[PDB]
Ligand binder design. Structure first.
Ligand SMILES: *[C@H]1[C@@H](C#N)C(=O)[C@@H](C)[C@@H]2CCc3cnc(Nc4ccccc4)nc3[C@@]12c1ccccc1
Ligand SMILES: C[C@@H]1C(=O)[C@H](C#N)C[C@]2(c3ccccc3)c3nc(Nc4ccccc4)ncc3CC[C@@H]12
Ligand SMILES: [Ca+2]
Ligand SMILES: [Ca+2]
Lengths: 416, 416
């Protein structure tokens, strides 16, 4: 008898992460968990074949079933259009899913005691709450071909007025222009999720903006967060001896860098993207990070592996050359997704399994069993020998081996 | 007789940096150099009093005399408007100056051997080339009060055809919107300045963008850089065994983080702002960074103290209680400004003095004489005692004492 997992929406990806995703399912999930799996192929060839409709359908399924688990995908550029003979240069599927679901993407490093940090002081975790909606990821940008005016206009639905703002009058030559936006309700949900995360972790909360430059745009994020804080969370924060504070982005990055960690950092969409990669790398490895989208309904989540598709590895794998790919972030997309599914259904066994697989992952690396990238973190790539690491299959087999052990011990620990 | 220094534009600033600025002139510059000083008070009260006209006047004076030295200023928001009873929420003076002058702001850490880096690997320097024009710093942002359409339009003055794009149809409630732009000429100047800096330093060059998301806007920065490289700089980069590559910003912050340094990082306006503070902090301190605006003409510069106005120390100072503020970045604005003035006028004496004041500044800190904040970098703020540092005046007096010694030994060393 396997654990009755319930409904999970899965999104298949590309290149090396696609190969690894299938191994995770077959070796670590399917032998122990029985799921009502709703599969959507978000591979570059299937998104092309469906005119990117598959991405939209996957997002609607996540709304219906409340839990999604996503593999890393290619956001194509000119070179990818050539390689796959694409009909169009399809938009980022993470951007599409996030703009349908909305909410906040919570990112945290996956800490293994034997992996060295690149930032000395970071002894406690930094959780980034990245606003998942609008700004640059739902922007309208274009090339300005020559002289002419760029204007941005607002027309209320009542049709009683029109406001025209001059962006720029190009007098000689062209350039680029763009329009972007955000919604009050989305910012409000982003504020609530940031305050709630801070209270659940018992850590202070910092919101970063550039409101001295974007006085109206970033000023609105500052205003909404302060008003929600003062009216609904300030007394709860004081009771927990924590606090909420606004910081200018350039001040905040330096503050985060010299801190000892132990804080929630609410980031606007773009800063969340860039700063979560700097933080992940600061803790030791880019691919050692969780990434969970928490939707405004307080019920729907989408967990993902936020790193790349590992093309260099994929090319080696295609030529039959040996590869050593870190599967941890992809495993944690599954565990964070299964833990949330367990929390919705009150499934103690699924919750136990989700946590056990995270523990096994960390314990295996901590015992000295790891992929070539993690071995290069400790020893340095020139000093790495074949005996120091396990290839992709050896590591997956090793995790499966210890997962079988951990789960056997957990069953054997049960009182008669 | 003092050194004949020539014409320099000085922009006085705000709070703690304003106090330190007058100390630098009185103790380190004026006793040794005689200047045709064109002084502009960019203090918040004088900007309010002149309706920000003094800022525009200072930028025009920089164009005329080719060298500006700027003190850190307050960019007001709602709190600053309430504090100083401001007529308006004045725009950033740096933004005003940069958008009149144009160019690239080159930022690099000020290195002292006794100061520990927060990033262990950075054994070689990272030079950030911040595009000084447009984007967020010349954008049009506004609050969207309720439902309606926000549209962006281009109207050629003499072109193929006009176009209107929907940015967003706000269906329920309001939010925020913004339009921003950049110019081809400004991007081309940014490209040439970046390639020339890499060739002069002998290091590879990286340009960061988010061209996977802003396909047209950021794609143009990527296209302009590549075209200028392929036609005008590739062979020269190959001869020096260096290279130019484009990186996605989120890939770039993680690559920079795990690197050993030793490269030029061409950043877009916003990234240059954010990442320069991350890089300064990583090397040890925010107060240990140079910032020189290099204009496209190859003749005009504006050197500044890129950091804040240090409000807390200014509050302590107002209360009458002892302060210890790092003045090195403010001193280096003067020395970089004066070194460019000397290069323009073929002034051996001014060139010698500028370099001597930099040497003195580094040697003083390397001899264990420093400010409270710098003492906190080696020991950690809770372990720092009144014996570990000098007060603002004490450190300035020590620098002045050591400058007098270096210059006297330099005069005695002269061959008959
Ligand atoms: C300065 C210090 C004194 N005197 C002090 O007691 C605290 C209150 C104060 C905190 C704020 C602050 C800000 N900036 C600086 N120095 C600085 C920064 C960037 C550029 C130039 C100069 N110093 C302080 C100060 C402090 C902060 C941390 C550790 C020690 C001192
Ligand atoms: C050529 C090198 C190679 O031979 C290696 C193999 N097998 C893997 C290699 C690498 C190995 C050791 C140090 C540095 C790099 C690599 N590893 C990863 N890991 C990863 C996995 C999951 C998420 C994110 C990242 N990502 C990229 C590359 C590129 C270079 C590879
Ligand atoms: Ca990213
Ligand atoms: Ca800054």
């Amino acid at each position: 008898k396997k654990i009755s997992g319930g409904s999970v929406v899965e999104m298949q990806g590309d290149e090396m992460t696609r190969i690894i995703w299938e191994l995770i399912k077959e070796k670590l999930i399917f032998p122990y968990v029985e799921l009502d799996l709703h599969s959507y192929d978000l591979g570059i060839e299937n998104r092309d074949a469906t005119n990117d409709q598959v991405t939209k359908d996957a997002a609607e399924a996540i709304k219906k079933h409340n839990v999604g688990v996503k593999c890393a995908t290619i956001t194509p550029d000119e070179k990818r259009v050539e390689e796959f003979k694409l009909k169009q240069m399809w938009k980022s599927p993470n951007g599409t899913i996030r703009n349908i679901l909305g909410g906040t993407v919570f990112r945290e490093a996956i800490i293994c005691k034997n992996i060295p940090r690149l930032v000395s002081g970071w002894v406690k975790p930094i959780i980034i709450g990245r606003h998942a909606y609008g700004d640059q990821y739902r922007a309208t940008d274009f090339v300005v071909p020559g002289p002419g005016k760029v204007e941005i206009t607002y027309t209320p639905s009542d049709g009683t007025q029109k406001v025209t703002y001059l962006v720029h009058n190009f007098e000689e030559g062209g350039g680029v222009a763009m329009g972007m936006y955000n919604q009050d309700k989305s910012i409000e949900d982003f504020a609530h999720s940031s305050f709630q995360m801070a209270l659940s972790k018992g850590w202070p909360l910092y919101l970063s903006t550039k409101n001295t430059i974007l006085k109206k745009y970033d000023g609105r994020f500052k205003d909404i967060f302060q008003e929600i804080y003062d009216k609904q969370y300030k007394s709860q924060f004081e009771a927990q001896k924590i606090w909420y504070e606004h910081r200018l982005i350039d001040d905040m990055v330096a503050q985060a860098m010299k801190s000892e960690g132990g804080f929630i950092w609410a980031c606007k969409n773009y800063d969340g993207d860039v700063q979560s990669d700097s933080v992940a790398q600061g803790y030791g490895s880019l691919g050692m990070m969780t990434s969970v989208l928490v939707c405004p309904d307080g019920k729907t989540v989408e967990a993902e592996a936020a790193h790349g598709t590992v093309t260099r590895h994929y090319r080696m794998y295609q030529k039959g050359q040996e590869t050593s790919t870190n599967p941890i972030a992809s495993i944690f997309a599954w565990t964070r997704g299964l833990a949330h599914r367990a929390k919705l259904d009150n499934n103690k066994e699924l919750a136990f399994f989700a946590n056990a697989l995270e523990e096994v992952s960390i314990e295996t690396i901590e015992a000295g069993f790891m992929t070539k990238d993690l071995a290069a973190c400790i020893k340095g790539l020139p000093n790495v020998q074949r005996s120091d690491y396990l290839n992709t299959f050896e590591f997956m087999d090793k995790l499966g081996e210890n997962l079988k052990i951990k789960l056997a011990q957990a069953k054997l620990s049960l009182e008669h």
